[model samples]
Target chain A: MPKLDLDSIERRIGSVYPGRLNAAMDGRSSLRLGDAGGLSQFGVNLVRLEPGAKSSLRHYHMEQDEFVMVTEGALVLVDDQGEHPMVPGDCAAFPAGDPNGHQFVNRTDAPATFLVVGTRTPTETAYYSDMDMMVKQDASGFAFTRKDGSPLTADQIG
Target chain B: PKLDLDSIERRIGSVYPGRLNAAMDGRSSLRLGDAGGLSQFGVNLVRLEPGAKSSLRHYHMEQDEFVMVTEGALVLVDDQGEHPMVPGDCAAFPAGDPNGHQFVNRTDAPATFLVVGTRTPTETAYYSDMDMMVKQDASGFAFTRKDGSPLTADQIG
Candidate 1:
């Protein structure tokens, strides 16, 4: 209820991702500001991308609408469609059912932060260009599975 | 997805009775920047006159709304009844089947607030006072008894 303080928020929810690509950037993570666990109607996440780091794979949502607002630093957005140079105060909107699959790459030598808000749809499908794979999540948080609801393995996918 | 500030200001034509009522009682409402056309959300500056009520005590069927008090004091009255709301307080009401809610300027001075929410069709509404229900249609909104039976407009009382 008090005025929102970014520093306090970061301390509370910010976390670093663990992966081989972590070497590309010093540290990066998403701080959830709102979601079904909190606000229900909307979901907001604070994404931090270090210099030379890329956030997620180029992908598009099947049902959820998403918007991103750059809060600090610059972000280089690249997609098969086009590329966009973004700065603080700039915003991008990806309406539901759009084909402009997108992703953000922090090419700058400095860290960047942004806010991403999106709708909570029952089923969401996302395509990862780099991995040549399609990801699906059901309404109850289950990942892609076979017809019998068994999780799909890499061998099956291959 | 950009908006012209001047154009939006000109297009905002809803008559805000709350503003006039607040000004008459020496209170001011908070002003918010418009999202223009890009945002699916809209915001409004709200002021409540002392002891003056805000919004009819009702619930919406298809619109979800949120409010944040910027200044002064008030009371949120819903089906559960009155609770004090002060500066820095916030609340949200979802569309369809939520608590019937409304705010009242219970303080001697006026109260200022900001309301942000999505705009949607009004499918149904419930007025707690007369225990009546209203359903919206293409032509207009119509009131009916809670039992889903028809009632004459005069029968509403």
Candidate 2:
């Protein structure tokens, strides 16, 4: 690729998501750099969630650490114990193997956008609250199952 | 950090093999910033020897890296091939891809620049011409024959 203009890059790549949540508690939507391809492993994402929306399903990864920087709007980060309000320019890091089990909720009137970066561990496990499911990634990709070895049904999958 | 021209002029030096040479021999190095302990990412001002070269052409699996040209000139070469880089130019390589890249000081004088990247877990690195792949072990890092398939912990001492 030739020299790229930063403005052009932003204009070409920046995306937005609407109606990210429904009811009182649901992980409704996210807008990501779907075209990043291999760069996704490096975990560069621009995510926007609507008001009253939740990001992810209140989960945590076993071997994938994540960092998030709020670029616009605000969010309420809900963990096992309580909720913390975050604003623009705030950064947060979630270590690879912690049991905090966190997710973000935007209860404000405006949309919240943030940059999320993380490590790509091949055999990481993610637990989802909405579906009561645990997902693991093998050599190929992610698979859903119960805490045990039993296969999960459609209702139990996230 | 801010500085005047006098301080910059006094610190320039040359670079040599196993030793940092600058100024007199046309190669130099300057610390761009102090290590902040954020993610082990820092910047350095480096001057490559004219026709002397930098490190061996290698790749890193866990380090997301990039370089920005502050002064002079350089030729970037990798599996994708070579190109001239100038001031204000920058290049980035994502972690764990197979394109091994390196820079060459092609001019008569030295090439000064800055490189910034995050440090990650030690992983396998390959030197193309030597047909060798260096793997990181618990002790440190070492090289091995590329074609020798079945590797074991006993191989390293």
Candidate 3:
């Protein structure tokens, strides 16, 4: 039985992806509730996105399902079908093995916050929709690469 | 790839029954996340009337539960005791813990929150302040007494 308050938690910088992808995560941060509370089965994050910030390049999971619920301000849910404005109380879920990629972008000037929850998997692979990038995960943690298993860089031509 | 509010609102799902259901009678929940195609676990946005509860005080046998208050104030009741909470408050209930818990909206206005829980293949939950129990499997939830006997309607209360 663990209970926590958002104000008491430490906010961490966005995910550390390799190459140019790292810079794309700017203006994004997270209040990690799961880490602070010692949760084991799944993780919960209070994800904040500032103006012009996107959650991540559109990507789909290999073995974990993810869900998000908007709490403050507004963000646009971008995917294959297109964008939809997400206001407070609006929520969505992304299932694993669904090839259609997704990302949340704060197009509005004000900052936005959403609660993101997902399963913690022993092994998983992620595929970026428009990029040649993919992420591999094992016991040691995440590694990023191109579809051909090369380094991820902007210099690579399609 | 995409499911909207309209579709989500139409796919109604199950709510806990028996003594627990009565305790949460005025609460309205939309199982939207599942309709949005969630398969790993369950997510629900529950709204509670002025004097409602999220569920009957209970704890899971194998499933883990978590909650985040998003609107108004509610009292968090668990084994440790009642904790007053407002928006942005978060709580987690790990599996196999016997700490029964629920949220009570003592305020005059409505309260809302998000409840996320992992669905196990087989699960049994015991109510903290009642004589009822729930066992869930491939066939869905089955209600019974704490002693494993079939509970009559009056006995459930």
Candidate 4:
């Protein structure tokens, strides 16, 4: 609604994942620009990752399309195609249900950051490639479970 | 696209002057981005030469747009006022609300920015500073007035 400034926006620490699954986001932070402006259709986040930080556990969404743009520093993009260097100006898109679960890791000692834009689908499912986990989105937020709908504990996932 | 050189030449966008009016120049722009690959929305890398502008001050009735500066600076003029934008500056233009906005490159250097917006079924743009309206039909853009009225032959000149 107003002018844009990367510096004026609010910077937030940590991830949106529920506590148990948030372990993967350690040493990472984000600037919630979309939410700050009351954006609803899509989300825009400026994410910052420190050394050893990861965007998330490799995952694919069933109804949401996501795109990532590396703006600063460097990162390793991990997906079905395997790890590859992601430098500034490099971008990648993951369509809904592509089966190529994706995530990014900050392998360098310096910090890395990128802008992640994604569609906010109301009802959807996200599949985590390595953990055999699935997350469902509903009115009550996201519910994490196994791929087969089997009951899972926070401890089991943590 | 695996880190292609973010050069102005690599993008497949056209350049035009005053798609709306005749006195538009510094507003000339080269659109660089691969639209076919984008699924939900469109992303374009826009490079505006010195004294050029992005578009007329306008708002969308059915679309939302966002911009982030990659190099150089731009003057972001919206409902509130004119803002000086440098690299890393990002702006969001939500659908409706009629904020009436555009970017002007006043500096001597060329300014480059990324514009990501929703690709809706149809688009209707109303220019705030000028008495103009743009509607997208089956063929392409049709410019009219604020009330969907067409401009007469004399209006173009």
Query: Clashes per prediction?
Result: 0, 9, 0, 4
- For each candidate, give the interface RMSD after superposing the true interface residues on Cα: 6.0, 8.1, 2.0, 2.5
lDDT per residue, candidate 4, A1-158, as tens digits? Answer: 46655577788876657557677688889998777665667889999999999998888888877777899999999988788999887877777777888889999999999988888767889998987688898667888778899867667655
Candidate 2 residue-wise lDDT, A19-46, digit = tens? 2222334434433331232343444455
Q: Please report, as a residue range, the 10-residue window in candidate 1 chain A with the lowest summed lDDT.
A: A12-21
Task: Give the backbone clash total of model 4.
Answer: 4
Alpha carbon deviation, residue A29, candidate 2 (Å): 5.6
User: Worst lDDT window (10 residues) for model 2 chain A?
Assistant: A13-22
Candidates 2 and 4 compared: the better one by lDDT is 4
Candidate 3 vs candidate 4: the lDDT winner is 3
Error of 4 at A25 (Å): 1.1
CA lDDT of A109 in candidate 1? 92
lDDT by residue (B1-157, candidate 4, tens digit) is 3434444344322222234453455443332334224566776777788887887788888777778888899999988889999888888888887889989998999998888777677888888886788887457787877787876655554
| Every model: Cα RMSD to truth | 8.0, 10.9, 2.7, 2.9
- Give the TM-score of candidate 4 (chain A): 0.90
- Residue pairs whose backbone atoms clash in candidate 2: B13-B22, B13-B23, B14-B21, B14-B22, B14-B23, B14-B27, B15-B21, B15-B22, B22-B27
For A14-123, candidate 3 gives per-residue lDDT tens digits of 57677556788999999878777766778899999999998988999989899888989998999998998899878878898888899999999999999999888899
Docking class of 2: incorrect
True contacts kept of each: 0.01, 0.03, 0.54, 0.35
Q: Write the per-residue lDDT of candidate 1 for residues B3-111, one digit (tens) a residue.
A: 1223333222222222322323433332233442223444555777687665557777775656656578988888777777876455666666467877889788878
State which candidate has the highest lDDT.
Answer: 3
